[PDB]
Design a protein around this ligand. Sequence first.
Ligand SMILES: Nc1nc2c(ncn2[C@@H]2O[C@@H]3COP(=O)(O)O[C@H]4[C@@H](O)[C@H](n5cnc6c(N)ncnc65)O[C@@H]4COP(=O)(O)O[C@H]3[C@H]2O)c(=O)[nH]1
Ligand SMILES: Nc1nc2c(ncn2[C@@H]2O[C@@H]3COP(=O)(O)O[C@H]4[C@@H](O)[C@H](n5cnc6c(N)ncnc65)O[C@@H]4COP(=O)(O)O[C@H]3[C@H]2O)c(=O)[nH]1
Ligand SMILES: Nc1nc2c(ncn2[C@@H]2O[C@@H]3COP(=O)(O)O[C@H]4[C@@H](O)[C@H](n5cnc6c(N)ncnc65)O[C@@H]4COP(=O)(O)O[C@H]3[C@H]2O)c(=O)[nH]1
Ligand SMILES: Nc1nc2c(ncn2[C@@H]2O[C@@H]3COP(=O)(O)O[C@H]4[C@@H](O)[C@H](n5cnc6c(N)ncnc65)O[C@@H]4COP(=O)(O)O[C@H]3[C@H]2O)c(=O)[nH]1
Lengths: 343, 343, 343, 343
Amino acid sequence: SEIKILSLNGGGVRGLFTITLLAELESIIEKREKCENVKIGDYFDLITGTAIGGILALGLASGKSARELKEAFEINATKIFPLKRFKNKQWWNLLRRSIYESEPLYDAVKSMIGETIKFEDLNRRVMITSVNLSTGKPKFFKTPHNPMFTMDREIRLIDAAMATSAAPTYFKPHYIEKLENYFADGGLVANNPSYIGIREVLIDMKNDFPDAKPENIKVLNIGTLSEDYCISPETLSKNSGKGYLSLWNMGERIVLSTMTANQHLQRFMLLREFEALKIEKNYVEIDETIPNEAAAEITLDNASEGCLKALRGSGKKLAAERYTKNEELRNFFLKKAEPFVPY
Amino acid sequence: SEIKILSLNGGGVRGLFTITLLAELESIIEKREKCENVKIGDYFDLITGTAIGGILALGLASGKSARELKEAFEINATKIFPLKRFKNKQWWNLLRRSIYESEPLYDAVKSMIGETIKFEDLNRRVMITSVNLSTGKPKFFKTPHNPMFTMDREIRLIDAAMATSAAPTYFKPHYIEKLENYFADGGLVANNPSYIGIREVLIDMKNDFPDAKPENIKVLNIGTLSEDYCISPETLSKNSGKGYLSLWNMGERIVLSTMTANQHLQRFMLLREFEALKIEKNYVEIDETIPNEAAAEITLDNASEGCLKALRGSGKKLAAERYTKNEELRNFFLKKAEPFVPY
Amino acid sequence: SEIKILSLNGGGVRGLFTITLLAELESIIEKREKCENVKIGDYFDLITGTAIGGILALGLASGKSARELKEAFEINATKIFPLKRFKNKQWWNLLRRSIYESEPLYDAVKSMIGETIKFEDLNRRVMITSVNLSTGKPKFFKTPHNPMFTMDREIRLIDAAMATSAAPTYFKPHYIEKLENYFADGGLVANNPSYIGIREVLIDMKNDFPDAKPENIKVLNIGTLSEDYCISPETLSKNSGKGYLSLWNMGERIVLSTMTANQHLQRFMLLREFEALKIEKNYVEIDETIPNEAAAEITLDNASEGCLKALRGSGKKLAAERYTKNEELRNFFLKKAEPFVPY
Amino acid sequence: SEIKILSLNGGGVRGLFTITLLAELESIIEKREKCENVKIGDYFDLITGTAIGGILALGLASGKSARELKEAFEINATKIFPLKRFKNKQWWNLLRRSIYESEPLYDAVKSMIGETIKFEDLNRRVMITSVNLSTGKPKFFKTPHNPMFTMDREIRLIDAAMATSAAPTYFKPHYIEKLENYFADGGLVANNPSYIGIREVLIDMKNDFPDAKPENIKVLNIGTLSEDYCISPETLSKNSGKGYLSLWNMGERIVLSTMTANQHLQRFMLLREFEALKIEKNYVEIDETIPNEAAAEITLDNASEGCLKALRGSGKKLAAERYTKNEELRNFFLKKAEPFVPY
Ligand SMILES: Nc1nc2c(ncn2[C@@H]2O[C@@H]3COP(=O)(O)O[C@H]4[C@@H](O)[C@H](n5cnc6c(N)ncnc65)O[C@@H]4COP(=O)(O)O[C@H]3[C@H]2O)c(=O)[nH]1
Ligand SMILES: Nc1nc2c(ncn2[C@@H]2O[C@@H]3COP(=O)(O)O[C@H]4[C@@H](O)[C@H](n5cnc6c(N)ncnc65)O[C@@H]4COP(=O)(O)O[C@H]3[C@H]2O)c(=O)[nH]1
Ligand SMILES: Nc1nc2c(ncn2[C@@H]2O[C@@H]3COP(=O)(O)O[C@H]4[C@@H](O)[C@H](n5cnc6c(N)ncnc65)O[C@@H]4COP(=O)(O)O[C@H]3[C@H]2O)c(=O)[nH]1
Ligand SMILES: Nc1nc2c(ncn2[C@@H]2O[C@@H]3COP(=O)(O)O[C@H]4[C@@H](O)[C@H](n5cnc6c(N)ncnc65)O[C@@H]4COP(=O)(O)O[C@H]3[C@H]2O)c(=O)[nH]1
């Protein structure tokens, strides 16, 4: 009759906005409905995540409230992105090794989600998009909502969270000993896992949803302050005939353009499809754009207190504003989603 | 009742195998059906391509036969990719400028379709993929099959052909005066234009085909011998803790993994969508992998005198083999496609 | 039955985006309707402008098309904003004189609309916002659509255009000899004249339209690529306890915050009023934020060939996209507005 | 039906006139009606405020008499504006840090309404206009007269009152912990909160007042001895080609002209709208202008004993005169306003 999907983009530190918006939404539901022990993850039949959105997707899927994840986000964000290595993000340090370390990231998820629970212990469906560097193909960690799935049942949620967050430059690739393969972010293939989220319900979650059409699918995509990347007009008009050193500075501009264009495309097919069935209102996207002055400050991995306050303030402001105006946002929390019982 | 789509990937010189397979298919139809001057582009309701696939798609839709395109490819490939520039791909050359030149590529396209034909003159539907470097969004050049289109009616086909083939490293970005925006290769987004080709029929081509569903859509994807790129196990295991210089070589590994993973993802989406719909013979894919001992010679920008023969030999071989075996391949050419008359 | 208002924001060189969007909006109408010498000012019952939007508003009401105004914009942009003045914008050249001579701007307006035409020689209603520096009140130059108007019937249009474009820091205040009062930029009061444009139709324009309500009013607000200004979170967090030199650098932050908030405020009451009456579709806004990379290049007074291409390219792109999607945008140009007969 | 709005303008210590006039009006109602315990806030259905007007608006809406607010105004004015800081307003002190301190202002507000009352506790509707420096948009703190409001309900009144009084040059920006956003004076967008007051009754307060029209809306805008700021005719004539040293005297003249022009504009559209329906009597404005020699002493932050007497004397003088003459002023205090109960 109705299927609700929560999609979280990958934004690193900017995932604080993703969790602050969800945490602020939890308090609004409790205050207005006079209830208690409200978890944002109980209203969604599928929770899709990618990069830092994947880590929050696993936390909500297990059963933790967004406020608890938000509390762990604040203390851990400084440890995950120390200021000693943020200032050393220059050429010869990057040319020698990846910045930061995976151990602070590993410990943060361990307290957040655990170190033993696997996908077969989850009562909520989840997707953790990632790419397999060993084979070159994208590998999507997910709960066995398909009865015939025999691969992701006994991985461990911490392995999926570490795999999708192992940024190609910001972190070392994550080795899963169970799979004997190395992994990287799902943002390389889908920074906005909202289109692929709709696909899974249509073709794979048929045991639970025998008749699933896009009209009965509602998507609540919470962005991470999506940056609209583009090459500067002066560089394009002046350095078009150059190469690498001037245009496409090292590999940076090629991948960032590749990520942004791919991210835009998946959103475009998501948008283009919905107007075809005239059901655009089913897609609720809650995201904004960083102002130019704030854009140079709020980066992917900036843990400074000033920008952390800005991310928290943006999430609190957007959550309250969109709840008042967007009626479709309020419809996600009218009823609790049925728990996922593996077949 | 039936919709046919031709999808062509991007491989550079390896696109000769795409046109050699189409050229040999044209001769087979003439020999068996006892006809003359058959056009391989007259049996498709929509022709979509990327990079070298886009140039071939534009040429086929303009009315030029695949055999004419085949002989044009042979002579021009030595000019588009000169031996002196191919041999001079040192790091300092790529760091100083872009290898190869855009002038020889411009002449090859001009000699085949012209320099004045626009998308409004074509009698065959066309979908060309490109990346708008000025904005970051993917721009898809197309004929006005949807009457509401008001952007691409007066852009020359040579402008779209040069834009989609503008490889980020192997060519300078193509500047379109009619749009004042710079463009890069369409292979950064949709190197396999198979999934997006079906989407256009179900979204934008609703005028000619009102009741269009994937069950009535047959896709003939002709690959360009694309290798399954992956990071070597020795480099992954030995250098997972390094950066740029060792792991993610400068930027090539990050970009190359991103393209193949996205290309895999779009291919996977098509396969998964078709598998669920219990029809898979609709997707006729004719592609192969280069043997390891021959993969070091057949490069996307290497022509030589043997690689020309090797790609041509594969095209003639695969055209005859799949025609004899794949029954659904023969069903593509059983009837000519209706002409595209813009509304 | 229906009243159409065209609102033009002020952005300096960014008005080239405003005129490029209007230029190809004329071209699309000329194509699809198969007409010639189309005038975009004939479809609007009232044209409202501010700063560079005011100059273009006066030109369109003279009976001239947007394409002719666009051609003069390109040649005069490098003349109104010389590169030598652009490079020398330090504090010593800003505290000693206004930067950018006013004569080059004078000739550009003179060469297009003339030098002797007055507000009584206009067949289209006009609103031009300005700040009367001598009295500290907003002075709104407008055609005598109110029959009791006896103030600006004999003032040259070049004086109103020169007054509304006098940016307080860039262009020195414009002395109107007919009124003996000095004037400054009209963007200090209403940088988005969309809201005040509706007020004029309801309050003063009661002779041409006796029964005017916001329900029967359609507004086509063409933006100026305006940036949503805000103080950087790093500066607010660390330097909120300081004054002037650190926070509110000299005075730039106070004026920019005051103008941006006021522009936001007037935009907000426009949205709230239309939301209350369920006529949100009547307000058609065509604007787009500049990316962070492009923001450092597309400033308010940069007329470099790279920035001009981007502003022209954005206008070219937006005009075609919005025409295809926004049906309400197409409905503006269905019929020509009756000419304004002064009374 | 009838709807009464009380609007209080900002200005700092000149708000003593605003509270003295309200205090004298309270005593007049007691004396002529022969009653006791008269609250001036019980006769208005909405109280709009800004800067010192907003602080008084919160106090009146809390339920406290104007005389009680007036008594604390005289005692706290000296500590809020100490003479040592008032005389030390040289450029080298303003260029280093903001004049005055917000701690005495914090205690003065705390001693009046408290430190724990929130917008959900108020029985009277209220506005608090402010500028969100972190985002650039204007934020309007208000009681939940709209049942869908979810943001300001749990915000302490002392935070909103301190936000609207944060004059950009005089008081440091107020950092709200609950919102993680910095705020500035609300007089940057509305020094005269009268026009926006009428809008709310027609837009947000549609639940308590379904059939609300500007005809049934009566406004009592109490001024703050507002000065009609303008640039000196000698300066505009002698120095019109200079910049930022002789003209604009740094940034002070630009912000002052922008603030006064915006304040003039909002009053202008208020008068124009009321004049349109011939209901100009609905707007009762009780304000005057300081004489030229007196204005050199009575500033926005002058807490001298002589200046306080003049402001108190003017409030007592105007309260008796306007009550005698203005019949519409007497009609305000004829029936107590219905208390506001949140839904
Ligand atoms: N994800 C997953 N696959 C499983 C599991 N058990 C068995 N499998 C099988 O392994 C194949 C490859 O898995 P992958 O995640 O490595 O590649 C996936 C992933 O790269 C991509 N994909 C998966 N779900 C997707 C989705 N919803 N949208 C877009 N792409 C998606 O398509 C590939 C093929 O999916 P498939 O369902 O045809 O084949 C599965 C599936 O049949 C299991 O527990 N999880
Ligand atoms: N491509 C194109 N768009 C046109 C044309 N005339 C008007 N438009 C409009 O411009 C918009 C953006 O064009 P784009 O091709 O640069 O971006 C496109 C392209 O990046 C992508 N896209 C379009 N068709 C697609 C498809 N079939 N499959 C996958 N992605 C597709 O989605 C974007 C939005 O498509 P849309 O149809 O909603 O909006 C169009 C469309 O309404 C025209 O001739 N071509
Ligand atoms: N603009 C204008 N005013 C004229 C003219 N002939 C006589 N007047 C009178 O001069 C007054 C002040 O003009 P202004 O433009 O300097 O200030 C104007 C302008 O600052 C503002 N205003 C006018 N129309 C507006 C509008 N539609 N939206 C917002 N603000 C507006 O309100 C002020 C008072 O308008 P009003 O119509 O009550 O009084 C006019 C009007 O009665 C005339 O030809 N033009
Ligand atoms: N003021 C307010 N807004 C709330 C509250 N709870 C949710 N909201 C929502 O937040 C939006 C932005 O609030 P803001 O005060 O920061 O910006 C406001 C303020 O800058 C301005 N505004 C509001 N009422 C106004 C009014 N009466 N007159 C003039 N401007 C007004 O318009 C903006 C958008 O108002 P809106 O009602 O469409 O959207 C609200 C509203 O839907 C709440 O408790 N108070």
